[PDB]
Design a protein around this nucleic acid. Structure first.
Ligand SMILES: [Zn+2]
Ligand SMILES: [Zn+2]
Ligand SMILES: [Zn+2]
Ligand SMILES: [Zn+2]
Ligand SMILES: [Zn+2]
Lengths: 144, 201, 70, 89, 198, 441, 32, 72, 78
RNA sequence: AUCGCUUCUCGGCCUGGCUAAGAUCAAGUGUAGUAUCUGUUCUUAUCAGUUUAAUAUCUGAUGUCCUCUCGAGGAC
């Protein structure tokens, strides 16, 4: 029943996520998680993606409570919006040069792949064949 | 007219301004959702339909106040659903004589379905309440959720499946009485509403 | 974390190779094409091949995804 | 309301039915909520068999009521993750 | 062991997507190929900073909140601030006196106005794009105000009707050298509202 | 926009089908999964036409479908392996004309994941246990026992997961009244991933791994592991006990090898090719569709060749070892993805393209004009008995259920003079193709 | 929250800022 | 001037840019800020390429063979 | 001569109004607009350090004819 | 008109009784983890090992031959 009020609470959560204190970001991450799990399957993915545009910069936090809230918000956003946008967010950082940044991105991608192992095949990026092995599948190019 | 929307392997729909008089080709609109669209049925000038390789029907409209002579602009997905089979073709034309001018899509598995746009908000709310009652009253035989099955590839958005509405009329009489008490109506009135929705075409 | 979470299909780590991730993606794509009836019908009835012949070709292509490793 | 320790079993679930004591009654076994108890709890193995018959799938008191998953954990279907009985390691 | 930025720029089709430290990655070509797609997002800037994310402000002041239009149209803020100012002047003797003897009917307006503001007066807000990433700024450079177009305040201040006085010198001087790709409509590319150029 | 999508023309292409005594009576029931909806039919063999008794939409993708009957039960319960992680065993109720779920046990996550079990499903021949295995590295088997009210009491399955072990096909062997066992076509994948030169990929081969379910010991152990030279594209089980020997048969490109539990003759019978076939010899002929039909005393098998002709092979077990298999082309049928040989003169073959064929098997299977190739018959390992294309002599086709799958293109218009507009869909595969115009009244 | 702009230091309590009176060296550093 | 800023700011390693007079500027912030400057903008103008995003990554004189006047 | 002194303005024309006029005309890298410790008001004249000397030359030559907040804005080389 | 004194008008500038001081009082945890005070902090030379996206950290010598009395001169 929250879909009438998602657009009302969107700028409040947007102002809360930009706060200096980690408590506001953690509790707003819990807000995004419960709001994403609440009205899943109702077409409110634009405001959820807009909130994810503020949540996903906060993945570099080191405190355990706020990073647990960030992981729960990422799980709720991957349930609600879909694994395609999470794969789009993680594809440019899974092969990051930094060890810690690519480790955190690999943790998020491993959680997304545990949750969405079946649906990630159709949302896999279109990469051509290289010198190591063939990559472009010809079964998807078949038309009947 | 003055625009061509092409379905690629990665992008579901890319709209290029067909300036044949100016002899210039500029891509007016792009897309962010990756889909191997194998069908096209434009409901409007800015609306493009796509049938992905994983059997997902996605109708995406362009953003309003978009410049025709520009680029790097995305189109929001107005509706997205999973039909349960690989959709081959789609045409925005009335498949029945009179009634509703819906869009008819034929799948590669032998299925054909019409997506009737509900122009009544009260009827859409009654259908949504009946679907929410039937998703808990009658579980699926496979064990998967109806919302999970209808949104396997991408999440669903403003799409109502008529299979659950047809299966609601095929339920037991105690379950139909419980569903009518949850919907605050009669089971014969719900059957008449489903018959009117079927005859709307 | 969990041991079975790292031991799950499609899992990885911070030192996961690109060829290993591509091979896992190709094996998951082959398993999804084998599991789905509509995807196997779309990738099978386009050519002049049987359904079980396409299933055997996909089973060979699953091992062929581990064909040229590095 | 959680702790970073206490991984549960990560075992394949069976026909045994979970059981909750009154001190932590009504809680979700995963996310510790109180909203919409939807799916019953399966406790896999010898967590039920033996001296731990009808005990708590949480702290360890004498269980009185059937444990449940909430609807929010079964939105992502975390109920198939395995046995939720706490093993203190 | 690793090639330079010139080999990565020659190998990849997008040399602008190559980072400064992308050559020291284990797969620089794969990272450049992944970064060159249409739906990618960059790394947030805090991985290079020693400062934590949104932490080093420490001395600035901000406005508290801006409520949406329907909530202020219900007008809860007026008697809420009146009740807060009335409670601030109360004593704790009066506070427990009101605690044991309550007084209701304070606001008591209706249910229909909030029902209309939730449903009839419900307005969709402004949401940013999927690829947007908020950072330490991202609240000041709102011009993306097109270049080559004067602002409405500068047009009203110089008496420009909607003919600026310096638009004739701008047309006679050609395009500016600071923004050669910017096209000014009406004088160089023959412009709705204050944005008379791009 | 708010769209209430409704399907008008249902998909009829059956990807898989099973048959048996699922109706609870003497009438034969065949359940075919035509996509998102499974239809169970109990048509009269005297009339010969195929009529669907019931159809239920499950709203999911089924990766494996099977049926099983208990000890002495007149009803064959259907165990459905779908994309969801809950394996569902259901019993059809003919009074309500619908299937009621007896049990539904959750195993893992939903969807068609690689490690998610449900890709391969099998049951014990004695009605003892049901095994669900994944495409790779996951397998389980739950013991099915009768309750006090003759209810299917499910049990907790035992873990049978091994690292990098893909499965091609699996079947539960007939162990009689002893502990049940199941054979699988295992293939190693660890050495192919570890070796970068690709030599271990060529060195790898399919192996028949038979694991015995120790029900008394409450454990699962791999009994036998025989490596096979030919890669197993299919696997069938010979009817053990009184209908013949207890063993398996693996088919490949013009090579069918039968092996029993222990020392048996590996009769590598070549496939009976057509008499001067116009197809190229590079494409190997394999038993794509296999149907083992057991009579009251004897048993036989039906296989599909490369041309699509149904070939009947007798079971010359002779109580010692697999000696002969008289592979003669019994009839010429269309391109069927799966064929089932029921009793009481019924034979259903589900066409992958075009109309599925429900034939009436009036003869005993010996009414074929094609030549017969035997496994005990020696050859020069280059040709077999040239089975020419005979007509429908052993089984006469009595029902042609028209299916539009696969579909290529369609167009609906009111160009013709009728009460409803005509929808002409051009579709089909190979030469088996047509434009079907559909109109109502 | 209390903030010392001459020190650029946040304070949890009022007595934390009341004890922030180092501040002379920070004021001499921020004077130029 | 302090030295902890000189340590934890990258100023301890001085980076040279060849096109702006081969100038060796302290810190990688200055070298990554050369791609929008005054004299080094004159340097890439003297290379013969317009100041684009693809010119925002080049730090060598030879890279003008892969400039905007290479493909169309 | 990248820095240009921009004057001939009033209290309505500020540093952000000059930045908007720069984004219209020609880009300035930095802004120097000091104020008094007693009044604290914009004088209308500030040092706009441009990213190029040609931008400051076009500001001094072509863009020194506007009426910033009622007064004629003049840009000189600095 | 300048100067000093006196007086008045107007403009910013110090300005609440008595009694026994009238009397009396004033209580929370524990485990993790985070944030902020306060203190200690950071100029010797290139190169190499380790480390790092890169810095930082990190272990080792900091112009040679002869002579005179850390200094100077000589084919160097
Ligand atoms: Zn308890
Ligand atoms: Zn929960
Ligand atoms: Zn357990
Ligand atoms: Zn201070
Ligand atoms: Zn430079």
């Amino acid at each position: 029943m929250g879909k009438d009020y998602i657009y009302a609470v969107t700028p409040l959560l947007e102002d809360a996520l930009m706060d200096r204190d980690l408590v506001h970001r953690q509790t707003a991450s819990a807000v995004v998680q419960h709001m994403s799990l609440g009205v899943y399957g109702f077409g409110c993915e634009d405001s959820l993606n807009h909130l994810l545009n503020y949540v996903w910069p906060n993945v570099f936090e080191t405190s355990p409570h706020v990073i647990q809230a960030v992981m729960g918000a990422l799980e709720g956003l991957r349930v609600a919006i879909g694994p395609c946008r999470m794969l789009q967010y993680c594809l440019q950082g899974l092969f990051h040069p930094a060890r810690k940044v690519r480790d955190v991105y690999w943790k998020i991608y491993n959680s997304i792949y545990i949750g969405s192992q079946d649906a990630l095949i159709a949302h896999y990026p279109r990469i051509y064949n290289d010198d190591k092995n063939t990559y472009i599948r010809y079964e998807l190019d078949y038309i009947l | 007219g003055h625009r061509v929307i092409v379905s690629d392997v990665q992008e579901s729909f890319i709209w290029v301004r067909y300036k044949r008089n100016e002899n210039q080709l500029i891509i007016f609109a792009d897309d962010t959702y990756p889909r191997w669209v194998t069908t096209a049925s434009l409901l409007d000038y800015d609306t493009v339909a796509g049938a992905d390789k994983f059997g997902n029907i996605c109708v995406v409209r362009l953003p309003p106040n978009t410049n025709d002579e520009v680029d790097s602009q995305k189109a929001e997905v107005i509706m997205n659903y999973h039909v349960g089979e690989t959709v081959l073709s789609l045409q925005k034309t009335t498949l029945i004589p009179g009634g509703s001018e819906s869009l008819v899509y034929t799948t590669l598995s032998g299925g054909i379905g019409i997506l009737v746009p509900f122009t009544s908000h009260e009827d859409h709310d009654f259908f949504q309440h009946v679907e929410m009652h039937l998703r808990s009253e009658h579980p699926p035989l496979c064990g998967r959720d109806h919302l999970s099955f209808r949104s396997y590839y991408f999440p669903v958005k403003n799409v109502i499946d008529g299979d659950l509405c047809e299966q609601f009329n095929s339920m037991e009489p105690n379950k139909q009485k419980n569903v009518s008490e949850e919907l605050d109506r009669t089971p014969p009135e719900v059957s008449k509403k489903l018959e009117d929705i079927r005859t709307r075409y | 974390l969990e041991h079975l979470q790292s031991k799950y299909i499609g899992t990885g780590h911070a030192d996961t190779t690109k060829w290993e991730w591509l091979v896992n993606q190709h094996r998951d794509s082959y398993c999804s094409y084998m599991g789905h009836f509509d995807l196997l019908n779309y990738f099978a009835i386009a050519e002049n091949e049987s359904k079980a012949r396409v299933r055997f070709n996909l089973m060979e292509k699953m091992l062929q995804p581990c064909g040229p490793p590095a | 309301k959680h702790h970073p320790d206490l991984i549960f079993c990560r075992k394949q679930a069976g026909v045994a039915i979970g059981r909750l004591c009154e001190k932590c009654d009504g809680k979700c076994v995963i996310c510790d909520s109180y909203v919409r108890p939807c799916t019953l709890v399966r406790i896999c193995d010898e967590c039920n068999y033996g001296s731990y018959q009808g005990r708590c799938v949480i702290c360890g008191g004498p269980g009185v009521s059937d444990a449940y998953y909430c609807k929010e954990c079964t939105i992502q279907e975390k109920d198939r993750d395995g046995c939720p009985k706490i093993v203190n390691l | 062991n690793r090639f330079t930025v010139a080999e990565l720029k020659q190998l990849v089709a997008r040399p602008d997507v190559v980072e400064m430290h992308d050559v020291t990655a284990q797969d620089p070509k794969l990272l450049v190929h992944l970064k060159a797609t249409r739906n990618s997002v960059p790394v947030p800037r805090h991985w290079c900073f020693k400062r934590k994310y949104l932490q080093g402000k420490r001395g600035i002041e901000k406005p508290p909140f801006e409520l949406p239009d329907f909530i202020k149209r219900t007008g809860i803020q007026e008697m809420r601030e009146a009740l807060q100012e009335k409670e601030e002047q109360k004593t704790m003797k009066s506070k427990m006196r009101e605690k044991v003897r309550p007084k209701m009917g304070k606001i008591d307006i209706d249910y229909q106005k909030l029902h209309d503001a939730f449903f009839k007066w419900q307005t969709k807000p402004k949401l940013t794009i999927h690829g947007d990433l908020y950072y330490e700024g991202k609240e000041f450079e709102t011009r993306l105000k097109k270049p080559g177009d004067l602002s409405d305040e500068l047009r009203i201040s110089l008496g420009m009707p909607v003919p600026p006085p310096w638009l004739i010198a701008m047309q006679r001087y050609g395009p500016p050298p600071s923004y050669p790709n910017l096209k000014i409509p009406g004088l160089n590319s023959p412009l709705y509202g204050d944005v008379f150029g791009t | 926009m708010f769209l209430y999508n409704l399907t008008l023309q249902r998909a009829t292409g059956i990807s898989f089908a099973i048959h048996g005594n699922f109706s609870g009576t003497k009438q034969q029931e065949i359940v075919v999964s035509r996509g998102k909806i499974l239809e169970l039919l109990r048509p009269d063999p005297n009339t010969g036409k195929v009529h669907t008794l019931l159809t239920v939409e499950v709203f999911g993708v089924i990766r494996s479908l099977m049926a099983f009957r208990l000890t002495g039960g007149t009803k064959d319960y259907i165990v459905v392996g779908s994309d969801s992680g809950r394996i569902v065993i259901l019993e059809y109720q003919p009074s309500k004309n619908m299937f009621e779920k007896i049990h539904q046990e959750t195993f893992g996550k939903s969807g068609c994941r690689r490690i998610v079990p449900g890709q391969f499903l099998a049951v014990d021949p004695k009605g003892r246990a049901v095994m669900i295995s994944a495409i790779e590295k996951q397998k389980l088997v739950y013991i099915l026992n009768r309750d006090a009210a003759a209810r299917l009491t499910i049990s907790s399955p035992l873990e049978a997961h091994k690292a990098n072990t893909l499965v091609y096909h699996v079947v539960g062997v007939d162990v009689g009244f002893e502990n049940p066992m199941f054979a699988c076509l295992e293939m190693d994948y660890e050495e192919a991933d570890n070796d970068p030169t690709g030599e271990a990929a060529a060195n790898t081969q399919q192996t028949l791994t038979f694991y015995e379910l120790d029900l008394g010991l409450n454990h699962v152990v791999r009994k036998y592991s025989e490596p096979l030279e030919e890669h197993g594209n299919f696997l069938i089980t010979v009817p053990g006990g009184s209908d013949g020997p207890s063993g398996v048969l693996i088919c490949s490109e013009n090579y069918i090898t039968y092996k029993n539990f222990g020392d048996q003759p590996d009769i590598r019978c070549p496939i009976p090719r057509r008499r001067n076939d116009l197809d190229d010899p590079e494409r190997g002929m394999i038993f794509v569709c296999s149907a083992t039909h057991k009579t009251k005393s004897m048993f036989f098998f039906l296989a599909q060749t490369e041309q699509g002709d149904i070939f009947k092979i007798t079971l010359e077990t002779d109580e010692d070892m697999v000696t002969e298999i008289r592979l003669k082309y019994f009839d010429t049928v269309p391109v069927a993805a799966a064929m089932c040989v029921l009793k009481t003169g019924f034979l259903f073959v589900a066409s992958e393209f075009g109309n599925h064929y429900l034939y009436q098997i009036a003869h005993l299977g010996d009414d074929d004009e094609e030549p017969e190739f035997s496994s005990a018959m020696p050859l020069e390992e280059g040709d077999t008995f040239f089975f020419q294309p005979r007509p429908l002599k052993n089984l006469v086709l009595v029902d042609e259920l028209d299916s539009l799958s696969p579909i290529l293109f369609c167009q609906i218009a009111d160009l013709a003079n009728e009460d409803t507009p005509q929808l002409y869909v051009a579709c089909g595969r190979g030469p088996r193709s047509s434009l079907r115009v559909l109109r109502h009244g | 929250s209390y903030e010392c702009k001459l020190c650029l230091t946040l304070h949890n309590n009022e007595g934390s800022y009341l004890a922030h009176t180092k501040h002379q060296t920070n004021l001499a550093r921020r004077a130029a | 001037i302090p030295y902890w800023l000189y340590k934890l700011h990258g100023l301890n390693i001085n980076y040279n840019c060849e096109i702006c007079g081969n100038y060796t500027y302290r810190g990688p912030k200055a070298f990554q800020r050369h791609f929008a400057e005054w004299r080094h903008a004159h340097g890439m103008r003297c290379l013969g390429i317009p100041n684009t995003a693809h010119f925002a990554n080049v730090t060598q004189i030879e890279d003008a063979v892969s400039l905007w006047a290479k493909l169309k | 001569d990248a820095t240009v002194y921009v004057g001939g303005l009033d209290e309505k024309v500020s540093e952000p109004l000059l930045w908007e006029l720069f984004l219209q005309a020609g880009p300035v890298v930095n802004t120097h607009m000091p104020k008094d410790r007693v009044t604290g008001q914009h004088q209308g004249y500030g040092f706009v350090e441009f990213l190029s000397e040609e931008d400051a030359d076009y500001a001094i030559k072509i863009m020194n004819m506007i009426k910033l907040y009622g007064k004629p804005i003049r840009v000189n080389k600095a």
